[PDB]
């Protein structure tokens, strides 16, 4: 009924976009503002609507004109239904009309196979096409029986169908917990086998727990119908149970302690930096997820393994956003929300060679250690390599371990900002010692000095993290998709087509890669998706060198 409301236009898309085999099941009388009645081809009957309050309806025959338009669509329908019932096929060509009962059987036996999609219509606000869509329900919508059995696994290990027989083992899945003020914890469940019973005992294999279901309950659109049992294929809520969180498999209290499938894998796409202000809030936050992570396992919490700050795994802007209201409100926590940091690395360009001296001779524990090394940069992604390059043994055998633990060590705080100075090869080619003064330790320092300076001297370079990304996009949007990525300090790598879509691979800096979801979904109106992996570290464009001196 709303302007631009063109039925066809949809179908001109439902096969143009996704591309299925929909079937015109109705033709509206009065396109848009002139929304009166409607017509069902299959049953060639016409109904009408005199109002929008949903009262003055009626099945009034076709209004003069129109009529003709029908037929053909009621023929194609039957012609369509033909690809299912040979009976509704011959009778077609012979000149007989399929029975209103065998005709339905075709459509129905056809949808259920995911081959066709019966299209109907009507202003839901004006109460139109609803009572007819409802018939559309039963008439073509599958029954808990017409559907393919759930697989589960025995305690031993082997797949197996779960039969919808309300007399086999009891097998039910859970899917939604809710706190009721009147009856408390509610656990809506979909039964598959056996039959749950009011005032019994169940068993959740998932968390090996004996739950005691006390009361069964069915939600009626306006009251609490308290029933006595849910037989396989039926849905409702149980009252009792405490350890039963989402996706839980409940069997009889003796049945094969089996576990259904359920395995869904919707990981994240967008994260944020959450620093809980003074250590005070850092707690309110712990509890925050300690209950929020059960009330929605559609996220992930992680403490950045390199810098305190914790990440908040989401599945789209809004997602994390509205958590930020509850986690900050219904938890009164008030922290910070900026963006993650980047795991940088230090290293050098030119190879150097400096002295590592220590000696402290005043009178006793002399402390005498000294060494010379050969520092040389290695390919971005080389690692750590030292060199026991001591001839006869100017540097005793027993002290090398320690002169390494010293070099290895020092490499912790970079010469520039203080990050893991990596990607280099070290060569100990000299250094002397003292008979009495030297110490395992005295050397660990001297060597931790030779290094603490070769990097300062060999011109340091602030390396950074590069990612591997693959945006799946219809080459429709592609054009800009690649652009945007270029203007992101990134350099493209290719696009080997996929399905109707096309994939793009390339590298990027984690800094200039934040909140990419809501940027990709921008250049693609939604038809865009990406992945991401690590690869290597690489120099910052110098302009970003003095930038980081923070």
């Amino acid at each position: 009924d709303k302007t631009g409301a063109d039925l066809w236009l949809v179908i001109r898309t439902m096969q143009e976009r996704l591309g299925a085999r929909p079937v015109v099941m109705q033709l509206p009388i009065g396109r848009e503002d002139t929304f009166s009645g409607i017509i069902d081809v299959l049953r060639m009957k016409a109904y009408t609507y005199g109002n929008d309050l949903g009262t003055d309806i009626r099945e009034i025959p076709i209004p003069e004109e129109y009529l003709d338009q029908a037929r053909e669509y009621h023929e194609k329908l039957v012609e369509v239904a033909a690809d299912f019932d040979e009976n509704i096929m011959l009778k077609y060509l012979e000149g007989e009309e399929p029975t209103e009962e065998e005709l339905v059987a075709a459509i129905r036996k056809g949808t259920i196979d995911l081959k066709i999609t019966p299209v109907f219509l009507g202003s839901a606000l004006k109460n139109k096409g609803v009572q007819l869509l409802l018939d559309a329900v039963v008439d073509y919508l599958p029954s808990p029986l017409d559907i393919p059995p759930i697989k589960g696994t025995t305690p031993e290990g082997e797949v197996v169908e779960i039969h919808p027989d309300p007399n086999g083992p009891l097998a039910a899945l859970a899917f939604k917990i809710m706190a009721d003020p009147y009856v408390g914890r509610l656990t809506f469940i979909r039964v598959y086998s056996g039959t749950l019973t009011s005032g019994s005992y169940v068993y959740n294999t998932t968390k090996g727990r004996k739950e005691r279901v006390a009361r069964l309950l069915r939600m009626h659109a306006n009251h609490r119908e308290e029933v006595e049992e849910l037989k396989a294929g039926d849905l409702g809520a149980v009252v009792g149970l405490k350890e039963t969180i989402t996706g839980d498999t409940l069997v009889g209290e003796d049945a094969p302690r089996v576990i259904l499938e359920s395995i869904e894998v919707p990981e994240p796409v967008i994260d944020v930096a959450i620093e809980p202000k003074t250590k005070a809030d850092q707690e309110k936050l712990s509890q925050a997820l300690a209950r929020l992570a059960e009330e929605d396992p559609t996220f992930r919490v992680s403490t950045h393994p390199e810098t305190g700050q914790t990440i908040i795994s989401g599945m789209g802007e809004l997602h994390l956003e509205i958590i930020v209201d509850r986690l900050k409100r219904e938890f009164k926590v008030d922290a910070n929300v900026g963006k993650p940091q980047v795991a940088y690395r230090e290293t050098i360009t030119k190879p150097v060679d400096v002295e590592g001296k220590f000696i402290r001779q005043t009178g006793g524990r002399g402390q005498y250690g000294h060494v010379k090394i050969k520092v040389e940069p290695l390919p971005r992604g080389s690692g750590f390599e030292f060199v026991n390059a001591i001839v006869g043994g100017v540097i005793p055998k027993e002290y090398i371990p320690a002169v390494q633990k010293g070099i290895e060590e020092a490499m912790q705080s970079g010469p520039l900002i203080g990050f893991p100075v990596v990607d280099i090869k070290v060569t100990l080619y000299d250094g002397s010692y003292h008979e009495v003064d030297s110490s395992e330790m005295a050397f660990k320092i001297a060597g931790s000095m030779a290094i603490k300076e070769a990097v300062q001297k060999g011109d340091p370079v602030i390396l950074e993290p590069i990612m591997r990304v693959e945006v799946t996009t219809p080459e429709e949007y592609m054009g800009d998709v690649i652009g945007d990525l270029n203007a992101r300090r990134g350099q493209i790598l290719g696009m080997e087509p996929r399905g109707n879509a096309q994939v793009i691979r390339a590298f990027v800096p984690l800094a200039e890669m934040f909140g990419y979801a809501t940027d990709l979904r921008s250049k693609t109106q939604g038809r865009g998706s990406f992945v991401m992996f690590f690869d290597h570290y690489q120099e910052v464009p110098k302009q970003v060198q003095e930038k980081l001196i923070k």
Binding site: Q282, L285, S286, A290, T303, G308, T310
Partner: protein
């Protein structure tokens, strides 16, 4: 403050633990132990003897 007993623990900033009474006469001002295998605390990888302390499940034999 609290000891984290055992060899190797996966604990960090923000980790909620449970802790019991038990000083560590060696470190000063450590009058408590972290209860391995409690809330966020982990049982110790690979342990075999004395598992119940150190929070480690009887390995599926």
């Amino acid at each position: 403050t609290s000891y984290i007993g055992g060899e190797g623990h996966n604990l960090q900033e923000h980790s909620v633990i449970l802790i019991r009474g038990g000083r560590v006469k060696d470190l000063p001002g450590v009058r408590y132990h972290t209860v391995r295998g409690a809330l966020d605390c982990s049982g110790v990888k690979d342990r075999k003897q004395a598992r119940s302390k150190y929070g480690v499940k009887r390995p599926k034999a």
